[PDB]
């Protein structure tokens, strides 16, 4: 709820801090796209791929979109401060990045977490994907449903 200083300082973005779903309206599942962001305005700086890339690997497997294209797409929609920071370098990408990808590639994901399944991404979409998440630690995303 409080305004994050790196976001308001981020010169890749413009305008006010607002929930993702206010800036990028879609039919998101409740309480998944409420996270604060700003409109991304500057073109891509071509950030290196994240070291903890398992979310990209998982979505890539399920969509047949390369991890590079997924990552460049994230740089079209999110400010850089929300893509490369202490959290993403130590914990990886999150379900908030999944929501952003789901808007950018028009899919809804079922995430099979340790606490059960949950929907991420707009419902006004045709494509459906399955993602597995384990809390660990470390947090790990994998493609498909929880087997074994």
Numbering used by the authors: 730 to 877
What do the authors of the reporting publication say about this deposited model?
We also reported that the TYMV papain-like cysteine PRO domain involved in the proteolytic processing of the viral replication precursor protein, also displays a DUB activity that was able to rescue the viral polymerase from degradation. The structure of the recombinant TYMV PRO/DUB domain we solved previously (residues 728–879 of the TYMV replication precursor protein) highlighted its homology with members of the ovarian tumor domain-containing (OTU) superfamily of DUBs. In addition, the TYMV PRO/DUB structure displayed a surprisingly exposed and minimal catalytic site, with a Cys783-His869 catalytic dyad instead of the conserved OTU DUB Cys-His-Asp/Asn catalytic triad. The structures reported herein reveal that the loop harboring the 865-GPP-867 motif is a highly mobile flap on the otherwise rigid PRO/DUB framework a result that is confirmed by molecular dynamics simulations.
Given the two similar classes (mild or severe) of DUB activity impairment, whether in loop mutants or distant patch mutants, we also examined the structure of the TYMV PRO/DUB I847A point mutant (hereafter 'I847A'), crystals of which were actually obtained first, and from which we seeded the ΔC5 crystals. The seeding procedure led to the same crystal form, and the I847A crystal is essentially identical to the ΔC5 crystal. The only difference in packing between the ΔC5 and I847A crystals is a slight shift of molecule 'B' with respect to molecule 'A'. Residues 730–877 are ordered in I847A molecule 'A' and residues 732–876 in I847A molecule 'B'. The two I847A molecules appear superimposable to their counterparts in the ΔC5 crystal, with root-mean-square deviation of 0.09 Å for the 143 Cα carbons present and ordered in both 'A' molecules, and 0.23 Å for 141 Cα carbons present and ordered in both 'B' molecules. Importantly, loops 864–868 thus occupy the same positions in the I847A and ΔC5 crystals, i.e. intermediate in 'A' and zipped up in 'B'. The fact that the two mutants I847A and ΔC5 display identical conformations in the same crystal packing environments shows that the mutations themselves have altered neither the overall structure of the molecule, nor the conformation of loop 864–868. Thus, the mobility and zippering of loop 864–868, and the associated changes in the active site conformations as compared to the WT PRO:PRO complex, are properties of the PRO/DUB framework and reflect available conformations of this mobile loop. Additionally, the structure of the I847A mutant confirms that the mutation indeed reduces the hydrophobic surface of the distant patch (black patches in Fig 3). Mutation of these distant patches has allowed the selective disruption of DUB activity in viral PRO/DUB enzymes from EAV, SARS-CoV and MERS-CoV. Such a strategy also proved successful in the case of TYMV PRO/DUB, as we show here that mutants of the distant patch centered on I847 are indeed selectively defective in DUB activity.
